[PDB]
Amino acid sequence: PVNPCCYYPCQHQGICVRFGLDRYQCDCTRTGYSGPNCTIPEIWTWLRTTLRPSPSFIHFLLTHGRWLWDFVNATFIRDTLMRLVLTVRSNLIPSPPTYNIAHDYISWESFSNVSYYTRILPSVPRDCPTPMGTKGKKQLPDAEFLSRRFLLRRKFIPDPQGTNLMFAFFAQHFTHQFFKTSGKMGPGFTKALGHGVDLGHIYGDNLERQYQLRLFKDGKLKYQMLNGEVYPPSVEEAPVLMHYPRGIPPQSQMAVGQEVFGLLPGLMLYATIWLREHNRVCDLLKAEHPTWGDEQLFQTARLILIGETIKIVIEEYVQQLSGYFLQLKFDPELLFGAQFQYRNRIAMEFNQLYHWHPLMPDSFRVGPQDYSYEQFLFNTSMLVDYGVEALVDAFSRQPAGRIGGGRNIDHHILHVAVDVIKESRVLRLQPFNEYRKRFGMKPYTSFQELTGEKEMAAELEELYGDIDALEFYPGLLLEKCHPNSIFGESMIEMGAPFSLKGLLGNPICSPEYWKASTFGGEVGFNLVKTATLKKLVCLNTKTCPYVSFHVPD
Amino acid sequence: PVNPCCYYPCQHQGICVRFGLDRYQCDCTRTGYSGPNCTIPEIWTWLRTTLRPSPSFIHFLLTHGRWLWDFVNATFIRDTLMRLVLTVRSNLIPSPPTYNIAHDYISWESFSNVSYYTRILPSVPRDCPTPMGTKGKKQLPDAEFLSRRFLLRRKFIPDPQGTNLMFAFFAQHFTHQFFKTSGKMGPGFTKALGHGVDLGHIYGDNLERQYQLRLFKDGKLKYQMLNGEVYPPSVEEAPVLMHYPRGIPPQSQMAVGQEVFGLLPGLMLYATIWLREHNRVCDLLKAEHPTWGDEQLFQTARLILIGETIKIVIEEYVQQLSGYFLQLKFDPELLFGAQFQYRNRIAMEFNQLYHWHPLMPDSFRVGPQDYSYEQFLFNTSMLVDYGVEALVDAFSRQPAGRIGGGRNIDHHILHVAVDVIKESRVLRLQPFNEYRKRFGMKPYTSFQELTGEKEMAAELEELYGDIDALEFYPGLLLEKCHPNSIFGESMIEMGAPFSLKGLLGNPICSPEYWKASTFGGEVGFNLVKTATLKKLVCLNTKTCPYVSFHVPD
């Protein structure tokens, strides 16, 4: 007998529970719907659904008018809308968390065991006819071919939003504090136990590592002086596990929070910035607190850095990414009147979603010099001899790639795209159309409606068979891209929920934490509130170069 | 220079931060108060404080006039009040949590490291003149002598509320799932990482141990059958670490979630009840879902037993303890309106508070037979000799001892009381009156006001010197009891916040979790809703004896 939940019979966040031998029922409490499958709307929701404009109309409003939005930003409407954005986006995520790789149901282990990644949609059951549920062919398309035919870059398609490499390396550095898929436990498991903006990519995911990175004097982290400039210390000085090529001198090796940051100079660049920030913050804290011990100077400085990160992400990072004329604002006080759970669990969906690999260009330009992938990768010297200020200027000037649209990931890093598609099948993720339903969108009727283009659509028809068989990661990477945007609509409608939930779901945003005491007084509290990417770099360097998430134009 | 925060200058929930050499500044954010010390009230606070009745007046209303409460319990006023009972009690607790034994401030480590017990008040700083801060003598009164002169039982004083040993054992059994002080790590640390009603005393504090208890067929835990009755398995079948005295046979040894439970027949009794219940629930779940594997059958059965506990504890356990004429009601939907955090962390002060050793009698009576402490303690044969039925009847008829008042903890277990006081000083807990202010009460002006008694109050002043120097634990047990009640006001006013926060703060009480599907449909969802102490026993036994938290009368 065929498993009923393979058809995904229930709508609007309803739960498919199997009863008896071949039967099923659906629990649709607080979904706003009624019925056996739950399609009958309630008084309130029927009014809510007919007076709702499409996600296209909202995107059109936020990205048009210059004009209307200049007024909104200069008034209280700015805060009224920001509260609404935070409210409506975050509700689309289970909190407390629901499912994981092992359990397609709510359990105590799924709540307690933080080594698991979270899961919004249940897995595609192993007793389903097709691998994507009910619709499609017996064997899924080849992971290698799809990447080679639809993802592989041929011509460099730049980002129309003016995104630079400086963003890319930030989008990698920042993202790697909550995405740490373990090689030991395998897919669906994480090492980054902080599950968000904890800075376990600066201080480390465990305490043993943290104590090694610390100088134990003035609350500062260890450092080495190269060319009269502050850099992360050598492994010979602070012995921690770092993924470096075998044979590299211990002096050249640099010790940081995240063990992967050594492989790219861009990652080690940001690791240098935050380090240089942490220590100078300790200097400002010791100025008004001479009685404070080493522990307090350290722990308070961390929270300031956590607060600065979220400020810079919300107000500057996401701002560039969204392309809104609405001036996004980091103010936790906005959620003080509403019901919000101050916790977050990192989902595998978000992991799969955040594989923005098409940012990485064909080469890496540093001023008059041009560097290849074989030259740029694993380079240990490049960080030091160029310096921070000269290297930041280089990444802030070079244009980054277009994420959406397709055919825009370099061949050197193409081996990651296939792993994502292969790992998705191991996770048994539901088809793209089912993930659109969950995030308040309409499922695509055809492959034509997905891409808008004709040629690439016909080839996807023949491979997948049905549109309801299309996979999660290819769907996002091949969705039609509205002329002057970085990616398709689904990326925003799915990404923003996870993003905003994790950024505001931080405990420092809660009423009990969001106060001057937590940050050692007014001085620390203002540092959190007035932080910008420009002040993160230039206040730490010697000369202030060009620094933004957009190219100079 | 003397540390300014030793005087406790910051009134109400105001945070004392130290600035410069000999200065301090006080952070009165969201406390309702203004000024350098948090003493100038806002419009609303000034209104609220004048219209607010004293806690002793409200207790009088809740424990008098049966006629008025008969009208309230049969109407929605029962819900309106119960919601208010939940909201205003839980609001007195920081969530996300604040301090621990290592940090007198807010830090990420304090939020992240689950091994720590929490603090509501920060510790008495190490650089204060007296050990209690500013007032009292240079050396605190002898811990061993305090316990012998004021706490030691002489004549048996039973509880006037008619509390039986059946309650007392439940109290101990239930409470030891979140109280697990690590001997390896020391005081201020816990092994119960679940922090609340997770049933880590039934399934274990870790996953490696959990699996050892599980049968892995039909979601049931392992069990052995003696005399025809179901009992927890032997260590020979389920090899888990337990604190049995060296020399005991592996057959008479019985394996459960909590390692200490093998020491007392009362603790091992309840362990058998919840064992039979879990396996009983698995039978009913298998009936509805034949397709379910072992894991889903187990995980759901755990959640149902989690719900059953939170029902019994509120509607019967706390009902008996409080003696309120208002019928307490467990409905998570009451908190669906206001702002609530579904997150809990056990405080070290909650640990000190729950040490209700006066509950235990001079001897243990089982029908026409009487068992001394030497006989009752550590017996393995005892619970199997009489069975569950006879033992349940026995403890339900014997009266427990009054916790408050004084002189009611038996000499056999008196050594614990000494350790609690000794540990308090290691944890450096703030004086009793400072804990009173924090829980919305007035500090005691003298020792006479605390006791309502002449002789023992006079010696207390001779031992301590100042009332503001009285310690947390002795202050709770040596407080004037209201006539007919089980303990003094302070234990209600401090305990109930911790108790109701840990019960309703459980993720199963959240909108995401509190669904029919979570408990495998209607059958499991009603089991949670119709859970009583009587049902927990009668359904799992052949014959049902007297079952209640109070003596028959």
Ligand SMILES: *[C@@H]1O[C@H](CO)[C@@H](O[C@H]2O[C@H](CO)[C@@H](O[C@@H]3O[C@H](CO[C@H]4O[C@H](CO[C@H]5O[C@H](CO)[C@@H](O)[C@H](O)[C@@H]5O)[C@@H](O)[C@H](O)[C@@H]4O)[C@@H](O)[C@H](O)[C@@H]3O)[C@H](O)[C@H]2NC(C)=O)[C@H](O)[C@H]1NC(C)=O
């Ligand atoms: C978060 O979640 C993850 C995954 O759930 C978890 O990771 C670990 O999970 C398990 C359990 O700890 C680890 O171990 C694996 O499980 C098997 C068990 O299978 C067999 O076990 C029995 C054999 O052991 C014992 O046998 C005799 C008696 O039978 C006994 O006397 C001996 O002492 C002996 O130990 C056997 O009876 C049974 O029939 C099974 O065949 C282990 O054998 C082995 O170790 C497995 O690897 C995993 O390694 C962990 N990783 C993963 C990826 O699963 C985390 O622990 C959890 N985190 C937290 C904080 O809880």
Ligand SMILES: *[C@@H]1O[C@H](CO)[C@@H](O[C@H]2O[C@H](CO)[C@@H](O[C@@H]3O[C@H](CO[C@@H]4O[C@H](CO)[C@@H](O)[C@H](O)[C@@H]4O)[C@@H](O)[C@H](O)[C@@H]3O)[C@H](O)[C@H]2NC(C)=O)[C@H](O)[C@H]1NC(C)=O
């Ligand atoms: C919960 O959080 C607890 C915070 O106290 C953790 O405490 C435990 O781990 C600590 C470190 O792993 C222990 O602290 C000590 O640190 C000193 C300092 O030396 C430092 O360690 C290096 C290796 O030993 C040295 O090379 C280097 O010099 C460095 O400065 C060390 O001498 C001690 O040996 C010890 O490591 C601490 O003792 C320990 N227990 C307690 C009770 O504090 C827990 O790790 C954490 N628990 C869990 C379950 O996550």
Ligand code: HEM
């Ligand atoms: C040229 C630089 C890049 C290289 C060499 C690279 C390569 C890799 C490799 C080999 C892995 C798997 C290793 C592992 O973590 O187990 C990985 C993971 C990942 N990458 Fe990249 N990639 C690059 C660019 C980027 C960028 C710019 C982003 C930012 C969006 C990104 C996002 C991610 C994410 C989110 C993961 C998963 C992390 C985890 O769960 O462990 N990658 N990358």
Ligand code: HEM
């Ligand atoms: C005769 C039966 C009892 C015995 C033999 C007993 C014995 C003990 C002992 C030896 C300790 C360790 C204290 C220490 O660190 O020195 C302890 C802890 C404790 N007891 Fe009891 N006790 C009994 C009854 C009770 C009762 C009725 C309660 C009420 C709930 C209770 C509550 C507690 C609590 C809350 C702890 C602290 C747990 C921890 O943090 O480790 N006990 N008990």
Ligand SMILES: *[C@@H]1O[C@H](CO)[C@@H](O[C@@H]2O[C@H](CO)[C@@H](O)[C@H](O)[C@H]2NC(C)=O)[C@H](O)[C@H]1NC(C)=O
């Ligand atoms: C690592 O980066 C450094 C840049 O500091 C590279 O050194 C440069 O190499 C180019 C040729 O590719 C020379 O023209 C420059 O004069 C070099 N600059 C300096 C300051 O030495 C180095 O080649 C890179 N490493 C690898 C392995 O490619």
Ligand SMILES: *[C@@H]1O[C@H](CO)[C@@H](O[C@H]2O[C@H](CO)[C@@H](O)[C@H](O)[C@H]2NC(C)=O)[C@H](O)[C@H]1NC(C)=O
């Ligand atoms: C509930 O879900 C099922 C499955 O998706 C829907 O379709 C089923 O029921 C119909 C009854 O008339 C049959 O015609 C279909 O063949 C049958 N299909 C499957 C795959 O089971 C059904 O329409 C939904 N019910 C409602 C009221 O919308």
Ligand SMILES: *[C@@H]1O[C@H](CO)[C@@H](O[C@H]2O[C@H](CO)[C@@H](O)[C@H](O)[C@H]2NC(C)=O)[C@H](O)[C@H]1NC(C)=O
């Ligand atoms: C706030 O509280 C402080 C400490 O409890 C009060 O005490 C201060 O003033 C006293 C004289 O009235 C001095 O003798 C104390 O030493 C001094 N404390 C310190 C740390 O300097 C103080 O009165 C209160 N503040 C105000 C403005 O009244």
Ligand SMILES: *[C@H]1O[C@H](CO)[C@@H](O[C@@H]2O[C@H](CO)[C@@H](O)[C@H](O)[C@H]2NC(C)=O)[C@H](O)[C@H]1NC(C)=O
């Ligand atoms: C533990 O208690 C049990 C009760 O079951 C004791 O066993 C009984 O002891 C009583 C004495 O009051 C006698 O009537 C019986 O002979 C015993 N019954 C059996 C079946 O042996 C036991 O002695 C106690 N253990 C200790 C160490 O004192």
Ligand SMILES: CCCCCCCCO[C@@H]1O[C@H](CO)[C@@H](O)[C@H](O)[C@H]1O
């Ligand atoms: C009418 C005033 C415009 C305010 C814009 C609010 C932005 C909220 O964004 C909304 O998020 C929801 C959940 O992700 C989606 O269902 C909506 O399509 C989307 O517009």
Ligand SMILES: CCCCCCCCO[C@@H]1O[C@H](CO)[C@@H](O)[C@H](O)[C@H]1O
């Ligand atoms: C007529 C009875 C009114 C019942 C409503 C009061 C129940 C709310 O509980 C209240 O919590 C407060 C804060 O912890 C305490 O100060 C009060 O003593 C307590 O009554």
Ligand SMILES: CCCCCCCCO[C@@H]1O[C@H](CO)[C@@H](O)[C@H](O)[C@H]1O
């Ligand atoms: C509004 C109800 C009117 C009844 C008058 C009520 C008398 C309340 O008087 C109460 O007596 C108690 C004695 O146990 C004290 O604990 C309280 O402090 C006191 O307020």
Ligand SMILES: CCCCCCCCO[C@@H]1O[C@H](CO)[C@@H](O)[C@H](O)[C@H]1O
């Ligand atoms: C220091 C703790 C103060 C908490 C007091 C909270 C009092 C609740 O305030 C009440 O809330 C109601 C909604 O439930 C509103 O209808 C009332 O207008 C409002 O007075």
